[PDB]
Design a protein around this ligand. Structure first.
Ligand SMILES: NC(=O)c1ccc[n+]([C@@H]2O[C@H](COP(=O)([O-])OP(=O)(O)OC[C@H]3O[C@@H](n4cnc5c(N)ncnc54)[C@H](OP(=O)(O)O)[C@@H]3O)[C@@H](O)[C@H]2O)c1
Length: 314
């Protein structure tokens, strides 16, 4: 239900994603989720809706539905704020849009540093993405003491390959360990080498894009669907659950936290009814056997960034 983090705080094994969640519909999404019984909201600045996602949390707090410490609000530092001077300001902007006084987990969104400016994705005239010469260990020391101003309860990372995680681990003075490396992970990109490396290290795995990110802007020629896989669909009807409900239960039982995005009030509901049933060893190893090494989000414009997390095997 809640996983213990290496900072002593417990983290709800189930939460709501807001990437691709419109400002108009992401206030009312969160409010309904919370009502339904969600206590974990996954936010990011680059997602552009945190204000509207923070109007949602202030109504439930006014309304006495939840106390602040019942919730577990998560956010991530975008690539253009990677310099020591920019980091506190970016947590502070997130902190005022959401309208909270502390975050519980603050994550480093990507390993890749970009040029600081108004553009989330800086480009040159050759069209390619412009990098900051800052590194991970520098950026980590700016986050390590957001903790010391008492702005965040915990700090983490998103999309680091095992080697990247290691850098922080053997950094002299490493005052604060990574509580959480959040990553993509579904039946087609099963991720068990990173998942079974982070876990030996006390780092918690959040699996994002758990349903296939069915609405991320890319669609290819003939992309694969999980929410519509025949094999995955049988496994569900056995459990009389839905293919969503099965694709959300899979991470959970890998001891992973799961953040399925929804702006639909009856889906937000469905996604919550995942607590009352087990998948079998057959199901979990079948589901597992389905991996195809395919990712939704591969950051294709930082392929050549010195800090591109995806050239390493895991
Ligand atoms: N850390 C990172 O760098 C990063 C990157 C990507 C994702 N993530 C996080 O992980 C969450 C992962 O979600 P994602 O955005 O990649 O998408 P997702 O969970 O794979 O799925 C979202 C999509 O699936 C639909 N959906 C929701 N419930 C469903 C249901 N029960 N039945 C059918 N379809 C369902 C949604 O529709 P409706 O909205 O129409 O209901 C939306 O189209 C994100 O929102 C975000 O918070 C983090």
């Amino acid at each position: 239900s809640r996983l213990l983090l290496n900072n002593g705080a417990k983290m709800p094994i189930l939460g709501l994603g807001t990437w691709k969640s419109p400002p108009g519909q992401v206030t009312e999404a969160v409010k309904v989720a919370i009502d339904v019984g969600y206590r974990h909201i996954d936010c990011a600045h680059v997602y552009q809706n945190e204000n509207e996602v923070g109007v949602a949390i202030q109504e439930k707090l006014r309304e006495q539905v939840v106390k602040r410490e019942e919730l577990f609000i998560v956010s991530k530092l975008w690539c253009t704020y990677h310099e020591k001077g920019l980091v506190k300001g970016a947590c502070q902007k997130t902190l005022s849009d959401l309208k909270l006084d502390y975050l519980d987990l603050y994550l480093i969104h990507w390993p890749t540093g970009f040029k600081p400016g108004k553009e989330f994705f800086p480009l040159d005239e050759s069209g390619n993405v412009v990098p900051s010469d800052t590194n991970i260990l520098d950026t980590w020391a700016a986050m390590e003491e957001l903790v010391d101003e008492g702005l965040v309860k915990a700090i983490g990372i998103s999309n680091f390959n095992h080697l990247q995680v290691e850098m922080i681990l053997n950094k002299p003075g490493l005052k604060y360990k990574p509580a959480v490396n959040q990553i993509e992970c579904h039946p087609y990109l099963t991720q068990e080498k990173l998942i079974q490396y982070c876990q030996s290290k006390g780092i918690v795995v959040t699996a994002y894009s758990p349903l296939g990110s069915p609405d991320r802007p890319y669609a290819k020629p003939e992309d694969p669907s999980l929410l519509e896989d025949p094999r995955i669909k049988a496994i569900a009807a056995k459990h009389n659950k839905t293919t969503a409900q099965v694709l959300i239960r899979f991470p959970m039982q890998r001891n992973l936290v799961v953040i399925p995005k929804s702006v639909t009030p009856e889906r937000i509901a469905e996604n919550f009814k995942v607590f009352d049933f087990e998948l079998s060893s057959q199901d979990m190893t079948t589901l597992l056997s389905y991996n195809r090494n395919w990712r939704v989000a591969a950051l294709l414009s930082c392929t050549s960034h010195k800090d591109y997390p995806f050239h390493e095997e895991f």
